[PDB]
Amino acid sequence: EGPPNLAFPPHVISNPFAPAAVGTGMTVNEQQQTAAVTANTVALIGYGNI
Amino acid sequence: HFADFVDDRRATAAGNRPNYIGFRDNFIGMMYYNSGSNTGSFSSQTQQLNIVLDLNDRNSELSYQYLLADLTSRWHYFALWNQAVDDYDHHVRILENDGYE
Amino acid sequence: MQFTVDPMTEPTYLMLLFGVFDQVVINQPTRSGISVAYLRLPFASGSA
Amino acid sequence: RNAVPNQVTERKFLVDRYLWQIPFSSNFLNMGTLTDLGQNVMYANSSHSLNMQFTVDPMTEPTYLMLLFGVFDQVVINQPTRSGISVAYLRLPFASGS
Amino acid sequence: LDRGPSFKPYGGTAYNPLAPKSAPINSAFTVGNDTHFVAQLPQTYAAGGTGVTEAIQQQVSGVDPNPQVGQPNYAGPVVVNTTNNAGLGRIVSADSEGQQF
Amino acid sequence: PAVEMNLPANLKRTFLYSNVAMYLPDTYKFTPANVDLPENHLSYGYINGRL
Amino acid sequence: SSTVVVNIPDRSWGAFRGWSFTRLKVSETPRIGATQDPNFQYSGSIPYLDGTFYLSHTFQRCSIQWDSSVPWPGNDRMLTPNWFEIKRPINQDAEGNDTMQ
């Protein structure tokens, strides 16, 4: 016996029961708390652990 | 170098501690006497038998020092063999405090 | 032998040395032939 | 392609099941069980003392040193009469005498 | 001895060996006019509605956050409330020399 | 929907763990969190319990 | 400790056969001469009686002297004539003196 012989999905980023959720980056203002959407960005974001 | 240093304006200096570096007396320590792996050889040709059989117990340095004390005097500096002998100062070692006439 | 020295704060040796008679004879009987024999008493070097 | 320059190498070895043997013979090979220097030491029944300084790697636990001098060891056992068995042991370099 | 750049005395590789060969690291790239963000966010932190205040208070350097600490230990594959939590990880920017691998 | 795993690297990692990593000297090992090992450092419980 | 120094007072060394030496751990070696060794708290392979030696690779050097003057073998036989050298590490040793890489 040894370490756990894990297997992984090849597209490695994913939610555990959902596809990789699409999104958009955010530019941020400082000295006041306001985040505006940025211009040319799409983002594949996976949450949690693999 | 530096004797004190607190600021660019104020700092006192002192010359470097003197250091004479030359060869040894009699060129002691130039050549491998009584080494293990490094015994030099005076052999004949047509044979190869080493005459020089060094020993670690034997000191071939300091046997030339005692012989040369017996053979000559000491105060004479002979520049060929680098025959210049380590002395000290008679008033630095034991110092007589007589205190400024 | 058993000595006693003043205690020093750094390690030192003891250059003890026993008086012996280092002796050679050199025999050169023939051209390109030479032979020596080293011998010292009492601490002789090399025997069985 | 992206290998680092200035690579230093070091060598070592590992022997197992082995005692470093040093034969007591003139050349360091075997011409006999009773060696040739094993017969010259008894010239005029002389006696020599022996000291051996060693050097090992510094290891963080106490260790012994299995040094073992090569000797001979013999028996005789004779049986001249029934219920008459007897011996004579003898170890030549290190005799257990009296 | 110089063996040259063609020397590779094993099979496989030594840097992230367990990964699937089709897997990219969390990076950003600029194919087209836009930039992209492929990302996995293993660390989570609590942030309510419009969590831009908690996003500023996260402190980062060359050693934090760590790419290999992730979730807590035995917390299973819980779906995270992105309304109630945010996520926290590392990207490598597209403004970098070399070929993205 | 499939999952991918490096098969010969996992056989290699198990071999390095159970044969080489498991047999370290006591200095490099560590006891895990929240476990009670016996004070006899030569007993079976102290040799087994450390990782 | 690196150096161990044995000493045998003089005796008849007639029909002597040779030497053999290998380190053994103290915790892995009992002392047989009693009916019980209470300090022996080990149960693995004992290399004192099984022959399972593994600490032969850990000697640097060795020297043998007869009655405080005679070096053995002496007579400048091998290239380090006054003592045996089991191993000499490279990054020292500008001389060759290294078999088997």
Next chain:
Amino acid sequence: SSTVVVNIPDRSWGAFRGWSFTRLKVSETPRIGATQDPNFQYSGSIPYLDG
């Protein structure tokens, strides 16, 4: 340490000439049987071979 105690084992003392002894610091004394002394980091007047 104050004392140092030496021994010579049993051997023949014929034609013995005498004794002589001083003290030498360990840092100030090299070893000549080696081809190189890596622990000798001193360059003053060596008393072992200058007298």
Next chain:
Amino acid sequence: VEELYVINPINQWPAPGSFSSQKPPGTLLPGEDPEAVFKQYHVVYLVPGAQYHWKNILIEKPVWIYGNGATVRTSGTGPILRIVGNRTEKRDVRIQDISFFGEDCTPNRMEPMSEKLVYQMAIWVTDMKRVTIKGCNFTNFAGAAVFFEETAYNGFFWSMQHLITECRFTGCRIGIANGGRSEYSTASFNNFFDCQICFNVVGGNWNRCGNIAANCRCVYLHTTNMWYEGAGGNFNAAHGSFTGNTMNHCDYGGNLWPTAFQLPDREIQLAGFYFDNARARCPTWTGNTQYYGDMKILNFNQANDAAIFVIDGCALYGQPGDTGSIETTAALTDKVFIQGCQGNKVTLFNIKAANVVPAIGTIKQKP
């Protein structure tokens, strides 16, 4: 430096007994069970700058723990460092210079308080007297940080003189908690930050004389049936002092915790000073700074003209809307006085104009 002493071989004897005990004089190494060390010694040093891992360390005899900059982490449902005493102990406890961490990082401030999180504290003194917590750092606790329980004692033996000074609390849900009958102790100069409740006050007659609470939702909580009451519960409560403290940014600014708290009986809306108990009186209130910190005076013991709540020498300073506002019940308008105060223009709910000197703030009514 080379050790050329000669050696004779071992004679196959049974070796004499060699022991290497007493390797710690009084210290405590990492990865060593602390319950067998706290039993033996009176003063236990720790390794300077170490990294520990403790869980449910039962302490019965009073010891001192010099931390020397140690770091004690934990994982699990148990408290760290359980201190259970008896009535008969002449010595005292001093826990000093340790940085207690939790099983969290940037804690889950949206998770509601429940029975699962109540045992997530780091020091839980059952009935040990004269404890001292001096120069510590408590981070990321889902439950309380400390909790001083006390069982039923008799004979006016109010002694139990505890000190909690010079501590730093970050991210803890509840700061200094205390059970009932944990009377007459001090807790001052503890710099709170990012906490939901700084003081879950059950036991009275305390003294809080310098604490700073920045970016904290609540500072002084006192209701009926809170969390963290212990055996010998809500009895003879809320009599302490509260002098010269700082509770800025409790409602507006950089506050991050929600307003609901979910008590074991009900849910309530937190404020910077929340007080609702018909059987308890009010603490003294001097020198406190409030920037944007609410106050809710709901109910105390004004029944037979027995208590009057007086704010003296304090700052109020809440301008935008109702941030930092002071709220009183309409049946308690005659008993809430503010004599000596400075404020920007702050909303006063149900407080008469003649009862406040000088005339500051906006007076409104909240039916």
Next chain:
Amino acid sequence: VEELYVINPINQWPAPGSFSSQKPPGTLLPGEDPEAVFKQYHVVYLVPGAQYHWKNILIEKPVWIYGNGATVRTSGTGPILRIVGNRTEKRDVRIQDISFFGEDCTPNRMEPMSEKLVYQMAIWVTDMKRVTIKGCNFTNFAGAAVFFEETAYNGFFWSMQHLITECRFTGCRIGIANGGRSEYSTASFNNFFDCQICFNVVGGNWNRCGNIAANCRCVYLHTTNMWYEGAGGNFNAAHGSFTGNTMNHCDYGGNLWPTAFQLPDREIQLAGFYFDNARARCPTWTGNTQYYGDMKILNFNQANDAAIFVIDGCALYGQPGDTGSIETTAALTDKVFIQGCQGNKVTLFNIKAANVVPAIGTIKQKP
């Protein structure tokens, strides 16, 4: 006790490697460079009762320094013990039990403040959070004693919880100085003596809860464009607490410093409480004792009825002439109140009679 073990002679070998490292476990000897020791360890002990000499000791990682009664002297234009941090440090700094001395003896109190003397401090924290100065003795500093700078941070991260307690300041020109944005920290029970300014306050929201200032010219300085502002200067200033302190003998008695101070822009006449900033509000003022200590309320933020300065529960007690007098600007008479006070017969410049209860002191006008 005589060591008669026999010895064999050395065999002309190259000797094996003998090393004598790890001679300090964690300590720091006198005459040793501290920058290489503070880099390696987390907790650095000092030799008990030693005599050090430090200058411009750069500290980057947070360490703890147990002084054990050490004495650190200095000479030169640099500060002692420069502490430069980053934003990402989980550990804290604790400087403890050290007696910092200066390059002076009975200091030059007639020399005016200038740019030459501004770097004569002993602890200058740039942006390190959670420092602690506990049980120290600072003597004879021509500049500040400490100075807590802070760069521009964002996101309401007000944390930076510092403590300065149990210290003794003698002869320092400026005591605890602090830069802008050095918010929400405490500094209490520091016994000042023979100082010109005890607090050069730039950053606000502090808490001062027990300090004693005997024979000091000024205690609370707040103007526009002081010394010791640092990067991220005079912004969001003067919001602290000031409770239960002691500032006796500031104008009459045993005071030795002159009245002029020579700010970088102008020169001003010091008082025991000097305050002139149109953008900053006033601290809370409770329980303070003043014997012969002046007060100058020049300008604060009373613009849209936004601040009212209230003296509560304090002593005034200045009889001879105008010693200990309270001075206000004639445009600020309606906003300076004194409710709850005791005084001998003290001169009040430009304060109305109805605004002070009880009726103490002599009311005069200073046009």
